[PDB]
Amino acid sequence: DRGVNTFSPEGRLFQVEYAIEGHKLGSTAIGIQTSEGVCLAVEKRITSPLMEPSSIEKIVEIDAHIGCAMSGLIADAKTLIDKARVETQNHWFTYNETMTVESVTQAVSNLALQFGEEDADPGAMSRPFGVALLFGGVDEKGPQLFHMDPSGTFVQCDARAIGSASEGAQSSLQEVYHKSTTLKEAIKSSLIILKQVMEEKLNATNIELATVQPGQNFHMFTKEELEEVIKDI
Amino acid sequence: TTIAGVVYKDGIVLGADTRATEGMVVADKNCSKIHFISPNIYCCGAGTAADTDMTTQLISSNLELHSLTTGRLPRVVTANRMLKQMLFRYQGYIGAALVLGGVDVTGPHLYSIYPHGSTDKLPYVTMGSGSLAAMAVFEDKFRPDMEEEEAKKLVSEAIAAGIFNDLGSGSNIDLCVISKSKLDFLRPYSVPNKKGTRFGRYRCEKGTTAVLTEKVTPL
Amino acid sequence: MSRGSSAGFDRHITIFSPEGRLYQVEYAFKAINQGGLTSVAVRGKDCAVIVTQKKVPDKLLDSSTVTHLFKITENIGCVMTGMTADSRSQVQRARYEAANWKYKYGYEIPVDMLCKRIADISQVYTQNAEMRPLGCCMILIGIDEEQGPQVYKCDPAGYYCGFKATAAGVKQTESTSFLEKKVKKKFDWTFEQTVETAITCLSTVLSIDFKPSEIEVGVVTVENPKFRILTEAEIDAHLVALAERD
Amino acid sequence: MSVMSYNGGAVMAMKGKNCVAIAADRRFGIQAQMVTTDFQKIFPMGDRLYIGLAGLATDVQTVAQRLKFRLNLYELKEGRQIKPYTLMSMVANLLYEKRFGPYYTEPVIAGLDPKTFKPFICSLDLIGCPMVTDDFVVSGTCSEQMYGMCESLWEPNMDPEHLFETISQAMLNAVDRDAVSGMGVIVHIIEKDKITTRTLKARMD
Amino acid sequence: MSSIGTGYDLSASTFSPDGRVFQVEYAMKAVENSSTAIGIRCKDGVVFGVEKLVLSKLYEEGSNKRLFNVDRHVGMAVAGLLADARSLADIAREEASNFRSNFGYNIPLKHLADRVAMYVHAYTLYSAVRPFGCSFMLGSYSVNDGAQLYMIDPSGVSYGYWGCAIGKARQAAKTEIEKLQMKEMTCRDVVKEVAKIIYIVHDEVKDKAFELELSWVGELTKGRHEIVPKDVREEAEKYAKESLK
Amino acid sequence: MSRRYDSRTTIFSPEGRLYQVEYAMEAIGHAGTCLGILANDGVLLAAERRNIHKLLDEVFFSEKIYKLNEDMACSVAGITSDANVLTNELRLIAQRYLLQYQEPIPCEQLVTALCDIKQAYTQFGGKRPFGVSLLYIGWDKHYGFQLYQSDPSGNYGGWKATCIGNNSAAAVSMLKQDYKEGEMTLKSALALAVKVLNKTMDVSKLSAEKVEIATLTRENGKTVIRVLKQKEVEQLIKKHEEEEAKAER
Amino acid sequence: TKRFDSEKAGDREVQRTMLELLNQLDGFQPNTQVKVIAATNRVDILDPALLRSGRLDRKIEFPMPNEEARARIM
Amino acid sequence: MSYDRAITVFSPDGHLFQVEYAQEAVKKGSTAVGVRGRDIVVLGVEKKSVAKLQDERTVRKICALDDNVCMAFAVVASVSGLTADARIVINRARVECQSHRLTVGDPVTVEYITRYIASLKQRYTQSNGRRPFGISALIVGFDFDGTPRLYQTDPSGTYHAWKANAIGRGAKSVREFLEKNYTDDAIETDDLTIKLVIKALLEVVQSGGKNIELAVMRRDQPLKILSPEEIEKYVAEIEKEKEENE
Amino acid sequence: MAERGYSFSLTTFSPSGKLVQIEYALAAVAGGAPSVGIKAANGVVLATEKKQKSILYDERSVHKVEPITKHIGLVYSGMGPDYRVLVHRARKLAQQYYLVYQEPIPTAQLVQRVASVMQEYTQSGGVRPFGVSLLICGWNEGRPYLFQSDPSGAYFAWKATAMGKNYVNGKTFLEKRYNEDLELEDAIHTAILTLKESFEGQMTEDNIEVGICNEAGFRRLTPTEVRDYLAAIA
Amino acid sequence: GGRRFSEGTSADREIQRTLMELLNQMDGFDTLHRVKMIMATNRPDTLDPAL
């Protein structure tokens, strides 16, 4: 035997290869960036609506002008986001500017891969993350949406979908979304794709909506507003 | 304060000491051992502060225990001299300890003086404490650099008693510790005087003018 | 089979085995023969002498540089027998141990004590599975500060004991046998005689007879505590002396 | 067995000897500063249940370090079916205070106890972090050491019974409380047989 | 060796029936596969020569460093795989760097060779880290021994050499050194001669071109260790090509 | 290390209970019977001493029963090397709690603290659990009188009368019928204790050396821990044989 | 490959066949004039009896290539 | 101390091995049900196998981390999961629970404690030499506005708010059935909340009303652990009511 | 050290109820040279036979009987390499206890302390469980002590026990001749009989060593004395 | 030279028999009056334990 820390005969790491496929078991993240705000839609991933939507969290505020929606292996994601909150805030605290979406994204990408059963300790990884994040927020330059994946690639996005089928979630986007479009269509364009990428229904207890907009912090949608957007497909 | 001396004779130590440790002329301790048996060929005399002196000797004593057992050959005097100098200086020392370090190595007898700072030095007869001068005036003349061993026990008993009686740094009794080179000889009576209290007639409270108050078992 | 059988993981790392010792430990003894060196150790009463073969595998070597005799302290000298890779490494470890005593004690370490600190060291390697035991053994000579000239040897597995005469090599059992008859018949020991016993015994078993640049003799005499290299001229002197004995 | 300061509202130990029993007398005093509210709480402790060791000054670390020492005494007491020697425990305490390095907080230990299974009389005091203190005479100790020392010489009855030492001691404690703030605050007198401990608690403020 | 499916050649805290680890031997092949480093001991200094293969025509000298300056009087010339060479370089630099600064004199080599070889060997012992598959030499000019050259193998064995070559044609290079007297010859002449052996090793039907790095620590530089001055460097190569033919 | 020498010594099973722990239970079985029975005024431990041979200096009080503290005691059934590491630490924690707190140590508190160390070995470290199951007898001022068991994993359960060693299954079954949760005085409790050793031990004549009963009773306002004497154990055995003959025919 | 202590299987037809080469190979039975061209990627699995100089006298290396060697093939 | 090679590694199966073994180990287990009241928030477990020779004290699955926060763990499996494993997650959350309780001036936010719980079981999955626990926990408490919560974690740390959630015996099976049981008129008084916990537990319990262990917790008063004899009285009332329904 | 290292245990239990490596270790102690230790109850005598088989050992130092400190001594069984660490270890412990008590380490206490370190060595990785059995003697506090420490970590207090070559025979003779609380003369005599039970390690005086602990401390006996005790047994 | 076998193949089956015969002629009941036998071995560690 040999590791997962070894190279395959392809000349690529074994552990990173496995991580992307792992994402596909779980939740979706759809972020559409328009010049009127950045919207995040994510699935609560329910078994019944009799599961309280009082404090299911999967879209969480990283900063109060940057929000983050997560996709992939949901468990691994919970610790990555909690951690992400302190580091962004150390940056917010020192610079005393409104954080840029691109700075939060770069910072979290080096933590993805530090894996190895040598040259690592308990605070360091012994496995790569298989969490792909969508950080969406408004900065000084304006609304930006960044995609982060386990290989650390950060890219600028106007619409990025990753989900249960990463491929699936994206193919629908091309079809619905178009470059310059209103906020209200942007929210809707997410509800039509959301279904496609889920194998599960449209329920108000099964989707979660959040908008970060100019002059306006990260907002969490309530049951009434969750319904307004469900109506918009 | 304290009274410690050594003399250089046929075997490693003839040690003289008072038992008492006094702070100026008040007794803190009526009897103690100021010249110590920890091993039986390494002996150490003490003076000055009690605390500083005990730790410096004990640390050497532990290192000596290892050499002694492995070789099955005698303890090494030099090792003891170097060890107290580096180790107590590092600590920076609470006050001063004049210590008399002594062991027979492989060669002749070596007696050393660790002064009030912290040092490794070579003489051959040491006296230590505030009474270093006082203990020395007898020792330096009666000893003429090796004398009869047995004669040295009479002479030393005489010197030691002189330190006790003329100099107020020594209550109760005087202790002599003799090693030829593995001997442990202790007689704590190098001065003639009564050891504790005397009660020929026994009254220390008038005949039951007070009575016994309660008896309990604390299991 | 045996000497290559799993029973735990004891043919891989140190843990006991069906053989009533340790397999990994036994390869470390077997390892001595591979190096190709054989040594004879004699303890005199004016010196303590070790003669070992000095491995010369080029003709582009300077004599001084290429040796197996090492100065551990200005009281102790040694020869390394076994695998040369392991030899350099053990000697550097010993040196720190000799030095560590050297400051504290204020005097030259006894030959017995030097062997005790290193022997224990070779045991850590042996106890550990983190590293394999040494493929070499260090055989010490020195003037003990009252007992006299002393010869101690620590094993590649690290146990040490005192010796009148010792041998380790390619042929450990046979050299030792040749050596007891030389002790039994007692010519006595001066500087020259004891060196002479030592070399001949190394020559007779292997059946070579040497050049002075392919044996090395190292002594610690009571001329001075410092360890010396005798060099080829004096080593040649001893070789010629061996003739028309006893 | 270093205790914070000495202010414990009372500091005094006296130990006095007979050939038929040996006695350790102690303030049972507790409560730091001049104000007390209490007059009870352990201070002398049985450690083999027939030997005592007394640790003296402020309550907290006095009780705390005694107990932590008790565990090392115990280890040695436990394993063998005969209990530890007084002479070996005497250096053990000396070292325990010494572990707390240069410019240490001052305790004053008093050990009173007959030796275990080699029968001779033993009294000793430690103070500071000092040289070995084996005596066979008498020992009095505390910060008002001179005041205790007087009394420890005062009670020895070499030939009377155990009982006469107690009644002499009751007066000895009282006269000492009028002389210093170290004696008093209730007094516990311990007459120690070798096979058990007898605790008597004396009448006296 | 063996090609057992569990350990011995797959670990290196495991000795063979004979007492050897197969893992160091596989590493020993690696010095043989690439170009040579020659180094000969003089008595006024040491002269080193490593041929650096021009693999790409868009390189400049200082690329794929086979020649390191260990201190300001200690050299290191390596042969074999360059990654294990770098590690060995780093340790050597720190060991040499503390000794000049602190003591104030030049390092006697024989101890240094033993320490570095201890480092190589300590790693061999372990199964958690690898044997080093480089062979390397250390060279120094000292005021306690004069010039010294020691060669340490991928096994952690140290021997002193009057004149060494480690590389892809040891047998041809050592022999040329044997014929010549360079053992106690003056460093200046040696520069030309070390280069000339490199010329024999090199083929114009196995190599295109090489870039000569020689290093001085000798009488020109007044015992200072510098990589060969451009004028001298060229002069020595110029001789190497001209004299064969 | 090496990953071919690793099939994971420490791992989770899908059956939820570690392989090495079930394997350790069989080892516990092998060592002799150690039991604890509750009294309504004490608690006692009864155990068979590892030694049974003529030769024994008798430096320990009993090899199995360790007197840990002045309100706590434990016995070990299983690996004796493994016993020495747990019993020495145990000695220190139980003692610190009675001494300082002036409040007698609960068994429930004690076990949770020790089990953390045992457990660490089973989940991570590449290690293995302890070979012993230890029976704690004590009194605390909280619940009252108690008996606790700990296992290799660091799993606990609090009984009031339990037996471990060989014929454990049979023993606990006998114990259920005669004792529930408190009905036996200190003397009946002790009689019950001798009875369980009797069936389970091969020798049914026993001896004071063969078995050791140590009692913990609070008498005269202080909690007393005592190892009973060879005479006292022998008197209990002599009383028990008469009663044995009559009980089972 | 000889190294057997095999009592469990291990054939020992294969044992005979390696041993037989040596037999033919010693001088007693001629082999001076006939050359054997021996080839192996792994000599990391063989024993010294079969290999080793003066039983198969010349030992020819082929190290990894370099640019010029690549140049002529291309 | 920790294992040099990792227990948990990303391998191809979609998750991880230890998560995968861990989901199996709470599936094959017994029922632990938690229903969210409007009085008291009550948790109960199916099995402890009580039979009157033993008494529960800390033996309980339900352990209070805090004055108003408690969690009930179902490590419990084919052959029984480990009380040893649960206790670590318990120790670490309880100290954190009390530190938050100190900081907030009204009853401790459950939310913090559950998020925390989820990260504790995940950090072991990324930590060298470690693996995640095979428990599922019902984190219960009241907020800083007094809002009752019943939350659940699985073995790798994922969290949801729930009205009522049931785990073990197939987690999906039992939790869909607890929705049916659950009424909002059956949580209006303290005995009715407790009756809903117990009805799910009765389904396949061996020797019920003794094995059934459930504890009640009040608004900021400590946990009240109910003995099985006292619990039995409620169990009789429902077990007859349930018979009547069929 | 300069590596990653090990930490995994080399011992895993069995559904037998045994630890595998300690059973292999037990075989190695039996393969040793006879070492007996008896507490008489008027002193403790540890006697051993040492296979040198050439008497080219100039030992006036290290032996199979080595004093740990001045009233503790140690005798082993099995192999020498494992002994070397344990003898050094014991001396260190002797030193730790010497500082605080200043009466060198007591026997009941020593064993617990060695036992704890021995257990780790099994329990942990990068170390392995011994295969030496130590017999520890001491006279301190006016009582003689004899303990046997097994290669697992276990400690038992014995009156008389045997190890080394043909221990089964030794322990059985020991029960018959020796009974509890017999004299110092009996303890010594049976002790030398067990060595004689089966010798075969060159019959010269320097091939047996005895070291005796009594009221005045511990000293090892000169080889010439040892031979006189042997001479009686035929 | 064979081993003790009896888990063997046909090849091993034959080898133990040759092994057996050699013992009986060489040092057994039968003896060798002036025939001396010379064995050459690279490593002897394949041969039967009796041999």
From Swiss-Prot, chain C:
InterPro entries: Ntn_hydrolases_N, Proteasome_alpha, Proteasome_alpha-type, Proteasome_asu_N, Proteasome_sua/b, Proteasome_subunit_alpha6. One of its GO terms (molecular function) is NF-kappaB binding. Its main location: cytoplasm. Pfam families: Proteasome (PF00227), Proteasome_A_N (PF10584). Keywords: Acetylation, Cytoplasm, Glycoprotein, Nucleus, Phosphoprotein, Proteasome. The modification N6-acetyllysine is found at K102, K104. The modification Phosphoserine is found at S17, S63, S64. NCBIfam families: PRK03996.1 (NF003075). Component of the 20S core proteasome complex involved in the proteolytic degradation of most intracellular proteins. This complex plays numerous essential roles within the cell by associating with different regulatory particles. Associated with two 19S regulatory particles, forms the 26S proteasome and thus participates in the ATP-dependent degradation of ubiquitinated proteins. This is Proteasome subunit alpha type-6. The lineage of its organism: Eukaryota, Metazoa, Chordata, Craniata, Vertebrata.
Swiss-Prot record, chain F:
Ubiquitous. One of its GO terms (cellular component) is cytosol. The keyword Cytoplasm applies. The 26S proteasome consists of a 20S proteasome core and two 19S regulatory subunits. The 20S proteasome core is a barrel-shaped complex made of 28 subunits that are arranged in four stacked rings. The two outer rings are each formed by seven alpha subunits, and the two inner rings are formed by seven beta subunits. The proteolytic activity is exerted by three beta-subunits PSMB5, PSMB6 and PSMB7. Component of the 20S core proteasome complex involved in the proteolytic degradation of most intracellular proteins. This complex plays numerous essential roles within the cell by associating with different regulatory particles. Associated with two 19S regulatory particles, forms the 26S proteasome and thus participates in the ATP-dependent degradation of ubiquitinated proteins. PANTHER family: PROTEASOME SUBUNIT ALPHA/BETA. This is Proteasome subunit alpha type-4. It comes from Rattus norvegicus (Rat). The gene is Psma4.
From Swiss-Prot, chain H:
It is found in: Cytoplasm; Nucleus. One of its GO terms (cellular component) is nucleus. GO terms for biological process: proteasome-mediated ubiquitin-dependent protein catabolic process. Glycans are attached at S136. Keywords: Acetylation, Cytoplasm, Glycoprotein, Nucleus, Phosphoprotein, Proteasome. The modification N6-acetyllysine is found at K233. GO terms for molecular function: identical protein binding. SUPFAM superfamilies: N-terminal nucleophile aminohydrolases (Ntn hydrolases). InterPro entries: Ntn_hydrolases_N, Proteasome_alpha, Proteasome_alpha-type, Proteasome_asu_N, Proteasome_sua/b. It comes from the Eukaryota. Coiled coil: none annotated. The modification Phosphotyrosine is found at Y159. Ubiquitous. Pfam families: Proteasome, Proteasome_A_N. Belongs to the peptidase T1A family. Component of the 20S core proteasome complex involved in the proteolytic degradation of most intracellular proteins. This complex plays numerous essential roles within the cell by associating with different regulatory particles. Associated with two 19S regulatory particles, forms the 26S proteasome and thus participates in the ATP-dependent degradation of ubiquitinated proteins. This is Proteasome subunit alpha type-7. It comes from Rattus norvegicus (Rat).
From Swiss-Prot, chain I:
InterPro entries: Ntn_hydrolases_N, Proteasome_alpha, Proteasome_alpha-type, Proteasome_asu_N, Proteasome_sua/b. Signal peptide: none annotated. Pfam families: Proteasome, Proteasome_A_N. Keywords: Acetylation, Cytoplasm, Nucleus, Phosphoprotein, Proteasome. The keyword Signal does not apply. GO terms for cellular component: cytoplasm; nucleus; P-body; proteasome complex; proteasome core complex; proteasome core complex, alpha-subunit complex. The modification N6-acetyllysine is found at K70, K171. The keyword Cytoplasm applies. Phosphorylated on tyrosine residues; which may be important for nuclear import. Ubiquitous. CDD domains: proteasome_alpha_type_2. It comes from the Eukaryota. The modification N-acetylalanine is found at A2. The 26S proteasome consists of a 20S proteasome core and two 19S regulatory subunits. The 20S proteasome core is a barrel-shaped complex made of 28 subunits that are arranged in four stacked rings. The two outer rings are each formed by seven alpha subunits, and the two inner rings are formed by seven beta subunits. The proteolytic activity is exerted by three beta-subunits PSMB5, PSMB6 and PSMB7. This is Proteasome subunit alpha type-2. It comes from Rattus norvegicus. The lineage of its organism: Eukaryota, Metazoa, Chordata, Craniata, Vertebrata.
